[PDB]
Amino acid sequence: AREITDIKQFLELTRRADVKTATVKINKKLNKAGKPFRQTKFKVRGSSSLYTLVINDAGKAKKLIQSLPPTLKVNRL
Amino acid sequence: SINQKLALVIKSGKYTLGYKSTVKSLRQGKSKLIIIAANTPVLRKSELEYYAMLSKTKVYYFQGGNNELGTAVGKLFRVGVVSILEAGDSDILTTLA
Amino acid sequence: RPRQYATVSKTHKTVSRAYGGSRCANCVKERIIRAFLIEEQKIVKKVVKEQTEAAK
Amino acid sequence: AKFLKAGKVAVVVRGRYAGKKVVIVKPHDEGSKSHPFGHALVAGIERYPLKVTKKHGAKKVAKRTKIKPFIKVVNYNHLLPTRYTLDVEAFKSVVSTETFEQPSQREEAKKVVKKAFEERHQAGKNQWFFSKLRF
Amino acid sequence: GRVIRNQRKGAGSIFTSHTRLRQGAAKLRTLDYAERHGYIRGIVKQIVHDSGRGAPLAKVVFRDPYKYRLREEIFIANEGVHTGQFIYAGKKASLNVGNVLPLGSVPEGTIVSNVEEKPGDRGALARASGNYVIIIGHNPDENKTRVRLPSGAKKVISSDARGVIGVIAGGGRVDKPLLKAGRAFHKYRLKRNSWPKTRGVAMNPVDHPHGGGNHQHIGKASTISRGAVSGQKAGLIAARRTGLLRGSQKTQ
Amino acid sequence: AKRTKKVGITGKYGVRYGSSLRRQVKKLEIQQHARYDCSFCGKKTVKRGAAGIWTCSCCKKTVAGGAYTVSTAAAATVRSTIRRLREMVEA
RNA sequence: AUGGGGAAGCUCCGUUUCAAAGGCCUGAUUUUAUGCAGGCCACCAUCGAAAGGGAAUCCGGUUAAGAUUCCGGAACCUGGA
RNA sequence: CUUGUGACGGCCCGUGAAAAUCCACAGGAAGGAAUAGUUUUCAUGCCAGGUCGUACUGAUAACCGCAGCAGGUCUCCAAGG
RNA sequence: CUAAGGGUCGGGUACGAUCAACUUAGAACUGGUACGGACAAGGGGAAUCUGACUGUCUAAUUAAAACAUAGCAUUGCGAUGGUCAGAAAGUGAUGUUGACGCAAU
RNA sequence: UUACUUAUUCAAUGAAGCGGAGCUGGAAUUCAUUUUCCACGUUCUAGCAUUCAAGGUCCCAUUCGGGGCUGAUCCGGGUU
Ligand SMILES: [Mg+2]
Ligand SMILES: [Mg+2]
Ligand SMILES: [Mg+2]
Ligand SMILES: [Mg+2]
Ligand SMILES: [Mg+2]
Ligand SMILES: [Mg+2]
Ligand SMILES: [Mg+2]
Ligand SMILES: [Mg+2]
Ligand SMILES: [Mg+2]
Ligand SMILES: [Mg+2]
Ligand SMILES: [Mg+2]
Ligand SMILES: [Mg+2]
Ligand SMILES: [Mg+2]
Ligand SMILES: [Mg+2]
Ligand SMILES: [Mg+2]
Ligand SMILES: [Mg+2]
Ligand SMILES: [Mg+2]
Ligand SMILES: [Mg+2]
Ligand SMILES: [Mg+2]
Ligand SMILES: [Mg+2]
Ligand SMILES: [Mg+2]
Ligand SMILES: [Mg+2]
Ligand SMILES: [Mg+2]
Ligand SMILES: [Mg+2]
Ligand SMILES: [Mg+2]
Ligand SMILES: [Mg+2]
Ligand SMILES: [Mg+2]
Ligand SMILES: [Mg+2]
Ligand SMILES: [Mg+2]
Ligand SMILES: [Mg+2]
Ligand SMILES: [Mg+2]
Ligand SMILES: [Mg+2]
Ligand SMILES: [Mg+2]
Ligand SMILES: [Mg+2]
Ligand SMILES: [Mg+2]
Ligand SMILES: [Mg+2]
Ligand SMILES: [Mg+2]
Ligand SMILES: [Mg+2]
Ligand SMILES: [Mg+2]
Ligand SMILES: [Mg+2]
Ligand SMILES: [Mg+2]
Ligand SMILES: [Mg+2]
Ligand SMILES: [Mg+2]
Ligand SMILES: [Mg+2]
Ligand SMILES: [Mg+2]
Ligand SMILES: [Mg+2]
Ligand SMILES: [Mg+2]
Ligand SMILES: [Mg+2]
Ligand SMILES: [Mg+2]
Ligand SMILES: [Mg+2]
Ligand SMILES: [Mg+2]
Ligand SMILES: [Mg+2]
Ligand SMILES: [Mg+2]
Ligand SMILES: [Mg+2]
Ligand SMILES: [Mg+2]
Ligand SMILES: [Mg+2]
Ligand SMILES: [Mg+2]
Ligand SMILES: [Mg+2]
Ligand SMILES: [Zn+2]
């Protein structure tokens, strides 16, 4: 139901006890006017609503994916 | 008469028409005489009358509806209270009032 | 709708002044005014008829 | 007279503190670079002393009589001026234009105004001012 | 044969009163210790249309003397009573349209509404839009007071009886011609099922005393004995006279 | 352009009812629809609302009155009669 | 329905009416499970709406035949902790 | 076009339901901190949600008219010229 | 084919640029004089009788001039009441009423 | 004929302030002194009026809490 944007607050979610699962979505999407780029969304499934964190930067995308708790049960695509 | 005096205050002196402005006269002390209409509600009444005695200004209860108080000051609209800042050539301050 | 007013924060059911979600400010403006003068005037009547009593 | 001077008690008529008696601390009769209106700086009473009684003893009396004060810039058209008055010496320096802006200033300000208002009330100097205006 | 219409209205079926939308029963404050010794104030918090009434009502709110609450009464609004007005009620009470005073405490010439026939009955006489009574005398010992009613009859009632200074708002209602069937239709739609009315002489003899004949005609005297039997009283019951009231009326 | 020689508000009734009937009603319709000076604030902002109830546009004061005009004759007289009689109570 | 009032009687009348009409908050227990202590409130049945009032759910998919009910996903309301 | 909604306006001797239920406000009984006390009307977390209907026709053949009867039977959706 | 009827912007303290609407009137040309081309869609006038009018009824042979209606007029009654209900009653309708009212013609 | 209330009858009220006497006022005019009659908390304003009441006073053995009396005159229990 929810959308999130403080990249930190997100990280604190994916370490919030009741959050067994999570999933990451990769979309082709266009930049400004001309070309495309690789949008990615970081969906945390909390016990009562589903918070999703849009990370426009394809670069921060790669280092964040590593940031994910290694006992979190992520589902890529 | 009482309207004849008003007509003299009206073409020689300074006044303000209406509630809001005649309070700024009572806080500044600039009022010499406020003229209250007949139908103007007792709260607006008693509230000026408290404002009045807090600046020692005298209060003349005009005995006619705000609508005729409007003809009294020569304006085409009603007024529920006047305030006399300067008595021009008239004598309202220093007669019966 | 009225059963929805128990699914909401209290700050959704008032404004901070006295008589928040009861009266409409102006109507509170008046009753402050009215009460004060009338409570003043009350006094005004007290000591005047203490004067009529001792001076009759 | 220009009765809006450092003695006058006024009752608030608009905004949160509406309904409570203040004491004008410093009038700026016309103008402000901020508040472009005739505005009085006041320190009125927020949480009035609750009634006390003979039954009331010990630290209950101490607690019933606690005051929560408050300072405030106010447009003039939101006070009614009263025929009462109360002295403003203990908090002449306390309540300044400079006291507003920067909240810690306002905290220490009220702190005085609080040690002051509880001074007046215990041994009931200015008794009207410590009673809730009921409307 | 058949039971005639004026007998059927008695068991009250289709005939009872269309009560759904009525503000309530208009009455006076109960006669408590405050109204028989001093006075008590209310505010007319609203005057408002009672449905099926000629006159407006006025809702007048008083404190409770014996408990902390507001009690509310429904008055018939006397003409010129306004919202926010103050209304004073009881013995030592003052003489203004709106207040409610014993018939003892007013002088002759007072004009007074919703007045009790016995004291404390919370109101009985002159209630309909525009009506009133006049006080026309007082006999102090045996504390009576003599009034003249909207009909014109001259009753004498107790001085401890109450009345509301004035006349009942809504006068002239009956001046305006009804003008078409439907307004009579809607008029009675909020009163009772009395409309429209069929001419007993358009009935068959089994339906009415007037019924039948090979032309329409009442056939016998349409004046009916005061001691007629149910099923007989249809005409001018017990009429002491008849024909067009020539000349001036008015009780003398 | 004056629209009607004489029927006035009543021209809605067409030809029905008969002239006396329409006349009579016009007098009271004209009475019941027109605005009225508010005794409390002066503005002619008093209109009708059902069987003798009269309220003020702004101001919102409501005054019980006559079925088609604010002040019925009889009440006015009654007023002054109440004046008259109460005078004898202080003076 | 009921205290009642009629009626030979099946029953008829009355619905808060000529009635001694009932029960919530906690406290007093630390013999203990719940008596007494207050302070309240005098509201006096009940039945009567699948078109009136009214807490809260949605899209996609699926069956020979069920779906705002199943499946998938994402919400919400209420009671309790 | 449909439908919804608003700010108005006309109309009445017509002025056009009730209760459950939810909220607020006035009040200020009372309960509460510095060695640390109050707060679940903010957020996040836990469990629970019974019973009964749910298919289909609703009509020139699934209803009522002796019937698979040219009759009768309440309503929502509504494209282009 | 002509003409008339609009929106949008920037102008120191006369005008220009563009966008989008079917109405209405005028004028040419044209035909086997036809064109609301199917569909859709009022007969009119003068009287007499009669009920004012809109409304109502005999389902299943009568829709009328008959009933009603506003309007008019009469009657009864201040509650210990008027009219009417019940076998009775600490019973009932009008009545949440009160003569600008209720009932009865 | 006209009085009486207790039968019977009617009204009202979540049976609230009835009756009788007295404190204080004061109109009153005194033919020894009172012979009586009225009275005896609220009226510019669409505010506020509730915790057996604050106060005063006495008790409990001084705790927090809590209670009398008075504040609210007496007598009769015939709800009016
Ligand atoms: Mg808010
Ligand atoms: Mg508060
Ligand atoms: Mg004590
Ligand atoms: Mg027979
Ligand atoms: Mg027969
Ligand atoms: Mg029957
Ligand atoms: Mg009924
Ligand atoms: Mg009436
Ligand atoms: Mg009727
Ligand atoms: Mg009928
Ligand atoms: Mg008829
Ligand atoms: Mg008839
Ligand atoms: Mg016939
Ligand atoms: Mg017969
Ligand atoms: Mg006969
Ligand atoms: Mg016959
Ligand atoms: Mg005939
Ligand atoms: Mg024209
Ligand atoms: Mg039901
Ligand atoms: Mg039910
Ligand atoms: Mg339902
Ligand atoms: Mg429903
Ligand atoms: Mg589906
Ligand atoms: Mg299946
Ligand atoms: Mg199969
Ligand atoms: Mg299906
Ligand atoms: Mg599911
Ligand atoms: Mg889920
Ligand atoms: Mg919950
Ligand atoms: Mg439709
Ligand atoms: Mg309306
Ligand atoms: Mg709310
Ligand atoms: Mg919560
Ligand atoms: Mg189905
Ligand atoms: Mg079929
Ligand atoms: Mg068929
Ligand atoms: Mg269609
Ligand atoms: Mg053009
Ligand atoms: Mg253009
Ligand atoms: Mg013809
Ligand atoms: Mg012929
Ligand atoms: Mg006809
Ligand atoms: Mg027609
Ligand atoms: Mg017809
Ligand atoms: Mg037939
Ligand atoms: Mg035949
Ligand atoms: Mg026909
Ligand atoms: Mg036929
Ligand atoms: Mg006829
Ligand atoms: Mg008739
Ligand atoms: Mg005629
Ligand atoms: Mg008559
Ligand atoms: Mg009778
Ligand atoms: Mg009767
Ligand atoms: Mg009996
Ligand atoms: Mg006996
Ligand atoms: Mg009683
Ligand atoms: Mg007594
Ligand atoms: Zn007005």
Could you explain the architecture of this structure?
- This is part of a larger assembly, with chains A (77 residues), B (97 residues), C (56 residues), D (135 residues), E (252 residues) and F (91 residues).
- By secondary structure, chain B is α+β, with helices and mostly antiparallel strands.
- Chain B has helices at residues 2-12, 19-28, 42-53, 66-72; strands spanning 14-17, 33-36, 58-61, 81-86.
- Chain B is built from four helices and four strands; from the N terminus they run αβαβαβαβ.
- Chain B has a four-stranded mixed sheet with strand order 1-4-2-3, sandwiched between helices.
- In chain B, strand 2 (33-36), helix 3 and strand 3 form a beta-alpha-beta unit.
- In chain B, helix 2 (19-28) packs parallel to helix 3 (42-53).
- Chain C has one helix and no strands.
- With 135 residues, chain D is α+β, with helices and mostly antiparallel strands.
- Chain D contains two helices and five strands; from the N terminus they run βββαββα.
- Chain D has a five-stranded antiparallel sheet, with helices on one face.
- In chain D, a hairpin with an 8-residue loop joins strand 1 and strand 2 (21-28).
- Chain E has helices at residues 5-8, 181-189; strands spanning 40-48, 57-63, 70-76, 86-89, 100-102, 111-113, 133-137, 144-148, 154-158, 162-165, 223-224, 236-237.
- In chain E, the strands form three sheets. In chain E, strands 5-10-6-7-8-9 form a six-stranded antiparallel sheet, with no helix packed on it. Chain E has a four-stranded antiparallel sheet with strand order 3-2-1-4, with no helix packed on it.
- In chain E, strand 8 (144-148) and strand 9 (154-158) form a beta hairpin.
- At the E-F interface, strand 1 of E face helix 1, strand 4 and helix 2 of F.
- The structure holds magnesium ion (58 copies) and zinc ion.
- The site of one magnesium ion (MG) has 3 residues of chain E, from loops.
- One magnesium ion binds at residues 16-17, 19 of chain E.
- Chain E binds four RNA strands through helix 1, strand 1, helix 2, strand 11 and strand 12.
- It is classed as ribosome.
- The entry lists the keywords ribosome, translation, protein synthesis, proline, aminoacyl-tRNA, peptide bond formation, catalysis, cyclic amino acids.
- Crystal structure of the S.cerevisiae 80S ribosome in complex with the A-site bound aminoacyl-tRNA analog ACCA-Pro.
- Chain A: 60S ribosomal protein L38.
- The organism of A is Saccharomyces cerevisiae.
Q: Indicate the proportion of strand residues of chain E.
A: 15-25%
Order of helices and strands of chain E: HEEEEEEEEEEHEE
Taking all Cα atoms into account, the compactness measure Rg of chain C is 21 Å
Helix content estimate of chain E: under 10%
The count of DSSP E runs of length 2 or more, i.e. the number of strands of chain C, is: 0
Bound molecules: magnesium ion, zinc ion
SS summary, helix count of chain E: 2
What multimeric state do the chains show? part of a larger assembly
| Rg of Cα set of chain E | 22 Å
User: Order of strands across the widest beta sheet of chain E?
Assistant: 5-10-6-7-8-9
| String of helices and strands of chain C | H
Structural class of chain C: mainly alpha
Tally of helical segments of chain C: 1
Biggest interface and residues each = E-F, 42 and 36 residues
**Major beta sheet of chain E, specifics?**
6 strands, antiparallel
Tell me the span between the first and last alpha carbons of chain C: 64 Å
- Give the helix/strand class of chain E: mainly beta
Distance between the termini of chain E: 46 Å
Percent of residues in beta strands of chain C: under 5%
- The dominant shape of chain C is rod-shaped
Q: Which overall shape of chain E is indicated by the principal axes computed on the Cα atoms?
A: elongated
Family (chain F): Belongs to the eukaryotic ribosomal protein eL43 family.
Protein name (chain F): Large ribosomal subunit protein eL43A
Pfam families (chain F): Ribosomal_L37ae
GO molecular function (chain F): structural constituent of ribosome; zinc ion binding
